[PDB]
Structure 1
Amino acid sequence: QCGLPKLMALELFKPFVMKRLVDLNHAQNIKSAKRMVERQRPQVWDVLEEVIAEHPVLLNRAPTLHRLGIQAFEPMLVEGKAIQLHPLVCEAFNADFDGDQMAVHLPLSAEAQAEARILMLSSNNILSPASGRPLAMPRLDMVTGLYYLTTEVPGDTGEYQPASGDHPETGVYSSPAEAIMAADRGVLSVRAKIKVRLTQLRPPVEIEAELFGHSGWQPGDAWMAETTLGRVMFNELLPLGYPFVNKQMHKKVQAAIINDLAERYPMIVVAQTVDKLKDAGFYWATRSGVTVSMADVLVPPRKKEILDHYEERADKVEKQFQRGALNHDERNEALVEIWKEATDEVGQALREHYPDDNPIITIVDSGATGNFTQTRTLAGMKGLVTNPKGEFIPRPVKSSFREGLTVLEYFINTHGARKGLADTALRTADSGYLTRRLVDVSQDVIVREHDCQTERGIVVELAERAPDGTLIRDPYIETSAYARTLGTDAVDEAGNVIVERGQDLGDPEIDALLAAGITQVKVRSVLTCATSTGVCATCYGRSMATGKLVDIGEAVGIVAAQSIGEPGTQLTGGLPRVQELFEARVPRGKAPIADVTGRVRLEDGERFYKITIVPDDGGEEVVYDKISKRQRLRVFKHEDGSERVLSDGDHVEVGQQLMEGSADPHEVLRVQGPREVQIHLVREVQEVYRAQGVSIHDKHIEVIVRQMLRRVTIIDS
């Protein structure tokens, strides 16, 4: 639902309202009906309500970064002149409430209304199409309200007490309604730990097995729980039959719950459940006592001592500069490290001194909003500020914003503040330009086939195996392994296959291969999809927003372009690195590569650097010439030691990175082949987006790299 003003809906639905005014004989003809709508006769308000009934509208907020920037809603006539927006869709629109407007579009044709009702409805688009993780979830006040009641307090009133002496066990309630009554009188706290007999919540799969196991828990069967009343009230929100969760509801926990709900439970259940979560979160955020005051901003206890120790070290470095023992360029770096360590010590003095009842800590630690760096700047010290040059000033801002900056401290802070605001416009400009380039390069990439039947795929590193025997989960599972489809049966040490070919890698199906010992999977990719123009659905995989296999006809290219271009607002590598990769430029790094596998011949000096390679089979020596300003990459030598700095005698493979930097993709192609250069571009872009906190599935990057290598040149006619 969305709330729109009556005066807006009257003009938006003007011809429909005229038609209905002439039908119910409120107006003689259509002409006088138009005059009635223009004069706002009191009848129209009763007619307008009948008109907008179940007629969806489209809400849009510029900039339209991704497809969720326009969503369909059911309009509700509300008084006033402002549009009422649902709090959960604020994340998709990136819409705060500080004076920004939205546009409303009214679909007329039956096809357009159907596309709004089915394709663009806000309830049918809970997940992010870029990453598959939910967006319409508790985010600010809601996560705090849920984090409140799902907290265990050791000394809270009404807490369970073991039977001792003449009194039996204290704090064991027969029904959750009895616990509610006890909390109403004032004996029990909502966050106190107690034992409750539950009868309408499925126990955890751990304890459900020992209690029943043979048959599933039934609505009506009882079982004891050691939770809090608030945790039971939270477990009442999510649908019946979901396993009880006795955790503390952090934002990560709620996100995991909603992701599991989207995977297993249907769509309407997820929508209604998140509505329940919204209501409960607001209710309990109102009563969570979250408030900011000057008393709650605690200053570090050892502030003077820490700053005096580091002032001592800074004065010693200044005296070492007075005698000329330190270069002027080195004094700044020395003082920079001194004050960085000082700021770290002050932050550590803040973490331990602040209790967990303090609201400023509760806001940050519950995943609501804000960093602890902001809290340190608030209560501890601003730290090293940057001048318009870029390097940190050798003198930091020792005062905190609670204490009050001095005149010169404020003046030197304004430099970094203003330049940070200034470069943001240009960075957004380049981001949007790259986004539109990506849109045009992949606008016509559509899913036109169900399965192109090619057994080709690519190997994905599911996990790594540690030397002791334990398997460590690879960090790239989320973006490269999940939501994929198999192109080769997964075989462990036994002859049995764990997951068949062509099965969507769900959440438990990844643990199936993880617990089987196999650590590499061959999956179908949009890179290897051999189709004339578009791509097939089987190579593409699971639609991150739909949670199922992609439908035939979905413009996955534009979705990929938007998925890459939406987070491009925040970068430092950086954004020029992304442009270097997508434009196939000769990079700034210009790192060399091993054209032929063999033996290394390091002929290093100081005037320059030269390195030859004796081919492992036939061939002749290949001589290179490189500047001594670079350094060799620690190549995973055949010795199984990854930190083997490339010295002469190492056994490097074909297409192996020699020195650090960025290898020329143009040269990677003419060495290892199109497949490998595609993989290189994919994960090289993924590194830039991963080093910033953005999770984009490799699928969308592969969609673009597929369009980069669709053409070949002609050598002989």
Structure 2
Amino acid sequence: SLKGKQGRFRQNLLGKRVDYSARSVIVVGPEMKLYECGLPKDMAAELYKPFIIRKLIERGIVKTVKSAKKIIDKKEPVVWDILENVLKGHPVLLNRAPTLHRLGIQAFQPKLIEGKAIRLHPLACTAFNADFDGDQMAVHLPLGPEAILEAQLLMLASQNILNPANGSPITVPSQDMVLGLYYMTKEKRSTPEEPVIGEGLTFYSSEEVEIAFNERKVALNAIIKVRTKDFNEAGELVNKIIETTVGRVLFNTVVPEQAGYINTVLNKKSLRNIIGDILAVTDVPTTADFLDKIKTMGYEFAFKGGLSFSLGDIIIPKEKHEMIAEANEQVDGIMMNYNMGLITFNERYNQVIDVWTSTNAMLTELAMKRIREDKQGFNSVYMMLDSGARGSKEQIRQLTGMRGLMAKPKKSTAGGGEIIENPILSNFKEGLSILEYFISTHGARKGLADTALKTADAGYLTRRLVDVSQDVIINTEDCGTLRGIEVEALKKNE
């Protein structure tokens, strides 16, 4: 009874089922603030029941607890009137399991919403590892004033901007937000076939850029010159004329003036660095407001751009058949050389692997180039890939070029993993054949099995690490030590 996961210690002493708790599916609230959450009316009414009872007795409506409970269960308008004010200043801890790091529990100030699903801020998703494909979250209600103060000053999501692992921001825009910001801050150059309105115009401030953009006289991606404040070589803010885009000006209307002027196309890496810099110069509240504003801007302009996924964006290179035929001819020549007796079996196998790898690399590069120069860099798939919103070179190559060479389904007893000589010449727009799909299912299932079976090891490692590091707490201020460690740059391959 005392031993194991189900034992007394690990089931009833180190972790307990708790009161004033709830659980429900999570939907996305994009119009909320970083420190807000949407609680369904029934969930809030059940969680905050003693507080509603206190207000009901104080108001003189009832004098006993049972009558107040009956009134609450009848779902009267007075209950909601009380609960609206009861909610204020009383945050709730949202938790998504597994709780790998401390950001898995975060305090949110709740608001009453319709429906039965918790509304969660999108920027918190990365902290929770939470998507909206069926995920569920748990709500815990602090009771004492010290617990509420801890929630408001240590757990509030607007305070959990930085990752404790490395110090870099964790509340960074992702997916639609990054795609919209990238679309707004990317430059477009005027050509005779497609003119860009308002190119080369000089503006006295961001005010005139806003006026011209609102009157539809300068395009969002037009290259303009604007007089704004920027650092000089000495670090002082001085007015200067910068060549930028309209979208960059609009993005900088919400960037704090202490961070200077940002004149770069916004991807995930640049956004992370920019949020870190703004937090370095300003404080947390300013960074939170900046995050909310740029979230709204990115969502708005991704929505306005109509960015889709069409088969026209998956431009299969016209040269694919030529490269495949040339590689087939090379493989035929290598096969002849092995047949009549110049190269060994291993040499022929290695040469075939080499030629197919080179052909796959060239095809991937050509698909990269085509998708990059399509629509002057405004291909939606390319914007998703280059902004960091979603995608990679491998997936796009599987969509446009070829799936490449696949590892053989050899057992662990067999030494090493060979590569099938015939690669998957087809991609997912053309359509894999029966044999190619059967080949791919082995790798897919191996990856899924690794995912589903090799997180118990991660949990065990985390448990052992926590138990060996539990007692390490900053207890004093100075250990009066003359000892230390030498730190130098970390160089790999010089």
Q: Which residue number corresponds to residue 282 of structure 2?
A: 265
Residues 1:277 and 2:298 aligned together = no
**Counterparts of 1:512-591 in structure 2 under 5 Å?**
none
- C-alpha contact (below 8 Å) 2:254/2:290 kept by paired residues: yes
Matched letter for residue 194 of structure 1:
I
Q: Is the 8 A contact 1:160 1:172 kept in 2?
A: no
Which of residues 156, 160, 166 is equivalent to 1:131? 166
Correspondence list, 1:51-450, <5 A:
51-155=86-190, 157-161=196-200, 171-198=201-228, 202-206=229-233, 217=238, 223-323=240-340, 328=345, 331-354=348-371, 355=373, 356-389=377-410, 390-450=417-477
Higher relative contact order (CA 8 A, sep 6+): 2
Task: Return the alpha-carbon distance in structure 2 between the equivalents of residues 407 and 61 of structure 1.
Answer: 40
Instruction: State the alpha-carbon separation in 1 of the partners of residues 83 and 445 from structure 2.
Output: 50
Once residues 333 and 21 of structure 1 are traced to their aligned partners in structure 2, the CA distance between those partners, rounded to angstroms, is 81
Task: Give the equivalent residue in structure 1 for 2:25.
Answer: none
What is the deviation of 1:315?
2.3
Contact 1:386 1:413 in 2 (8 A): no
Pairs within 5 Å for 1:669-684 = none
Summarize deviations over 1:143-195 as a string: whole Å, max 9, x none: 1111122222221523445xxxxxxxxx2234433333333343311211122
Amino acid at match of 1:314: V
Cα distance change on mapping 1:265 and 1:325 into 2, 3 Å: same
Q: 1:316 to 1:244 in 2, by over 3 A?
A: same
Mapped partners of 2:479, 2:204: distance in 1 = 61
* Partner residue of 1:3 out of 38, 42, 45: 38
Q: Distance between the aligned counterparts of 2:431 and 2:284, measured in 1?
A: 51
Give the match's secondary structure for 2:211: helix
2:428 and 2:311 map into 1 onto residues whose CA distance is: 11
> Contact 1:193–1:227 (CA<8 Å) still a contact in 2?
yes
Match for 1:294: what amino acid?
A: L
Indicate the structure (1 or 2) with the bigger Cα radius of gyration: 1
Contact 1:299-1:350 at 8 Å conserved across structures:
yes
The 8 Å contact of residues 301 and 349 in structure 1, kept in 2 or not, is answered as no
- Mapped contact 1:157–1:187 kept (Cα < 8 A): no
Question: Any conservation in 1 of the 2:123–2:171 contact (CA below 8 Å)?
Answer: yes
Aligned AA for 1:26? I
Does the aligned pair in 2 maintain the 1:26–1:43 contact within 8 Å?
no
Q: Give secondary structure in 2 for the equivalent of 1:84.
A: strand
Q: How does 1:473-492 map to 2 (within 5 A)?
A: 474=490
Letter in 2 for 1:148: Y
Letter of the 2:246 counterpart: L
The verdict on how the C-alpha distance between 1:46 and 1:475 changes in structure 2, with shifts beyond 3 A counting, is farther
Residue type matched to 1:435 in 2? T
> Structure 2 unaligned runs (5+)?
1-35, 411-416
Q: CA deviation at 1:10?
A: 0.6
TM-score normalised by L of structure 2? 0.85
Say if 1:388 and 1:419, in contact at 8 Å, map to a contact too: no
Secondary structure of 2:487 counterpart: strand
What is the total number of aligned residue pairs between the two structures? 445
The 5 Å alignment of 1:608-623 reads none
Q: Name the CA distance, whole Å, in 2 between partners of 1:461 and 1:350.
A: 41
AA aligned to 2:127 is: A
Q: Which has the higher helix share?
A: 2
Relative distance call for 1:119 and 1:320 in structure 2 (3 A) is same
- Contact 2:209/2:246 (CA < 8 Å) preserved in 1? yes
* Between 315-324 and 452-461, the greater mean CA deviation after superposition: 315-324
CA spacing shift, 1:452–1:313, aligned 2, 3 Å: same
Structure 2: distance between partners of 1:371 and 1:11: 46
Secondary structure of 1:122's aligned partner:
coil
- Higher deviation after alignment, 315-324 or 139-148: 315-324
Task: Report if the CA contact (8 A) 1:205-1:243 is conserved.
Answer: no
Partner-residue secondary structure (3-state), 1:58? strand
Q: CA deviation at 1:327?
A: 5.1
On the 8 A contact 1:160/1:195 being kept in 2, the answer is no
Which residue in the other structure is 1:530 paired with? Answer: none
CA displacement, residues 555-584 of structure 1 (integer Å, 9 cap, x when unaligned): xxxxxxxxxxxxxxxxxxxxxxxxxxxxxx
SS at match of 2:85: helix
Using a 3 Å threshold, how does the CA distance of structure 1 residues 308 and 11 change in structure 2: closer, same or farther? same
Quick one: which amino acid aligns to residue 396 of structure 1? Answer: P
1:3 and 1:89 map into 2 onto residues whose CA distance is: 13
Amino acid at match of 2:393: F
Mapped partners of 1:271, 1:103: distance in 2? 24
| 1:388-427 CA distance string (max 9 Å, x none) | 3243222111011011111111111111111111121221
- Normalising to structure 1: TM-score of the pair? 0.59
Cα deviation per residue 1:24-66 (whole Å; 9 max; x = unaligned)? 1222421111122223233211111121111010000011111
Deviation of residue 363 (structure 1)? Answer: 0.9
CA distance in structure 2 between the partners assigned to 1:429 and 1:408 by the alignment: 34
Structure 1 CA distance for aligned equivalents of residues 271 and 99 of structure 2: 27
Identity of aligned residues (%): 47
Contact 2:209/2:249 (8 A) holds in 1: no
CA distance in 2, matches of 1:336, 1:432: 39
1:318, distance to aligned residue in structure 2 (A): 3.2
- Give how far 1:128 is off: 0.2
Any idea what the Cα deviations from partners look like across 1:299-326, whole Å, max 9, x if unmatched? Answer: 0121011111111222233334445765
Q: Which runs of 5+ in 1 are unaligned?
A: 162-170, 463-473, 477-633, 635-641, 643-717
2:199 touches 2:218 (CA, 8 Å); kept in 1?
no
DSSP-derived class of the 2:241 partner: strand
